[PDB]
Amino acid sequence: PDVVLVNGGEPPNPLIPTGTNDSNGGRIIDRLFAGLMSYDAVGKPSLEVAQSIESADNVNYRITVKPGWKFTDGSPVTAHSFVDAWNYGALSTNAQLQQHFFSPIEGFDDVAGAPGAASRTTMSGLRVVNDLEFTVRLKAPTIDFTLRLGHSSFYPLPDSAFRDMAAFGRNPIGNGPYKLADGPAGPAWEHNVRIDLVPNPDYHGNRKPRNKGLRFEFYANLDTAYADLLSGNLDVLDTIPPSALTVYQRDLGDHATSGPAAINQTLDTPLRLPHFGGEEGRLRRLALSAAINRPQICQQIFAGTRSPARDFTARSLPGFDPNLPGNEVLDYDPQRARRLWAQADAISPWSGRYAIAYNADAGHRDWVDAVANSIKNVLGIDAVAAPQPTFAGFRTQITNRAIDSAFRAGWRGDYPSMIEFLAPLFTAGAGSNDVGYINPEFDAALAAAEAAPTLTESHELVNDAQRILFHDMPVVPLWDYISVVGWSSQVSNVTVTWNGLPDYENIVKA
Amino acid sequence: SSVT
C-alpha cells in the first residue's frame, strides 16, 4: 500500500472534537482539523490558524484569524467557526465530553452546570469583533489558557455541522492536514475495522504531510499487530504487546525507540460502588494503593517500560516532583493496607467481589491479573480481573455508568501541563471524572494554581493541591509510561512525540 | 485524553 499503515481503534464516540475525550477518536480528530495553535513533537505551540493570540494578563485575549483558510467543503474558516464550536462545547444541553476545557471563560457558568442564566446559550466572555477577530475574557487569570489553544476542544467547525451534528459526527468535515478518503471500495470509516485518510490539498499549515495518506487499522489484539509489524503488513505500532517486551529489541533493532511519555495508568473505583463511598471508601482506596507493588510490576510485567507513580500526573511534565510530602500513600505496605481496610470495615464490613474491568485490545491483561492477585493476597478478599473486548465498548459503559466494578483508566496528555492531568479528571463537573469524586477544596486549589503569574509558582501550587489527592485517593495512580514504538523497513522519519504518539504527518514511506 |  502507498499509505502509511498505523495502529488505532474504533472511536467510542462520533467524530466531533468537543465530543471526543479519548485517544482512539483523538488520533483521528487531530489529523482532520487545524486549530488556532498547533503543537510540535515536544508539545510546544505555534500559531497555526491564528494570525495572533494576544494577552498581557492571562485574562483578556485578542485572537485574530488568518484569512484564506477553508474547510474541505469549500466554506471559510472564520471567527464564528471558532466561537460557535466553543459555545457548542460549553453548553450543557449539548452534553459534550470536552465541556470542561471552556470552564475559565466568563459566561461558562451561565451555559454549563452552574448558578447563572439558564436561558443563555452562549458565553458572554466570547465576543466576535469582525469576521476574523474575536476576544475572550476569562473569569480569572489562567496560566495555561494560551497553551491549551492547540487542543481539539478548540477546533473550528463548518457552518453545516450545527444544522445536524449527528450527521457531522459520522462524516466530519475539517480544515486540517488530512481528510477522510473517498475510497474506491466502501466508506472511509469501516466501523470496528479501519479509517482511511488522505492529504487535504487545501491545507498549508505547520503540519503538512510528508506521506500520501494514513490508514488506522483497528486491531482486536496487539499480538496480531506486532506480528503484522514484523512481516511488514503494519508500518508503525505505537504499543508493543507485553509478550514482546523482552524481544522487541532483538526483533526490531534500530527500528524501535523508547522513552518517557506523558501518559499514566490508574485503578478507578467509582464512589457509587458498594463499600467504596464516603470515609469508608477513602480508607479502602488508600488500602488498595498500599496493596499494589508498583516497582515489582513495572520490573516484571512491563520489563521496565513503566515507572511507578509518585503523584497523579506524569514524570515527564514541567514542574513534576517525585518527592512530594505525603506521597508515601503510593508505597507498597501490606501491613498498612490491612490496617486501612480494617478501619473501613469498622464503618461497614466488606463483602462481595472486587473486580477490575479492562479493555483486552490494548495489552492490559498481565498487569490487571497481577494487581488483582496482589489485592487478593494482601487483603484477603475476592479480587479478580474482568476483561471486555474493545476500548469503545468499555468506555461506553464507563461513560453511561453501566459499569458495575472497578476499572483501569489513564490519561495521555493533550498538552504539557500538570493542571491538564488533574482538572479534567478530578474536578467536580468534569466529563472525564469517571468515579464521581467531588472535593471543592481541591477545585479551588487548582484555580489558585491557574492564577499564579509565573510557571514556577503555578507548579508549586499544583503540587500543594496534590496533597488533597494523596489524602482522598480519588483514583489509585499506578505508573507512567516509557513508550516503545516500532516501525517497518518501508517507512522512515518516525518521531515519537512527548505524549507517546507517532508524529503522523512527518512519517515518510518509499 | 483517556488512554487505550
Author numbering:
A (entry chain A): 32 to 541
B (entry chain B): 3 to 6
Paper lines:
The substrate-binding protein DppA associated with the Dpp transporter binds heme with high affinity.
The atomic model of DppA, refined to an Rwork/free of 12.8/16.5%, sheds light on the molecular architecture of this periplasmic heme carrier with high accuracy. Mtb DppA has a globular shape that resembles a heart. Despite the compact appearance, the DppA tertiary structure is built by two globular and slightly offset halves that fold onto each other with perfect complementarity like the shells of a clam. This hinge resembles a “clothespin spring” that keeps the two halves of DppA in a closed conformation poised to open up. At the interface between the two DppA halves, completely buried inside the protein core, is a tetrapeptide whose amino acid sequence was modeled as Ser-Ser-Val-Thr. The electron density for this peptide is well-resolved, consistent with a tight binding. However, the physiological role of the tetrapeptide is unclear since DppAMtb was produced without the signal peptide in the cytoplasm of E. coli.
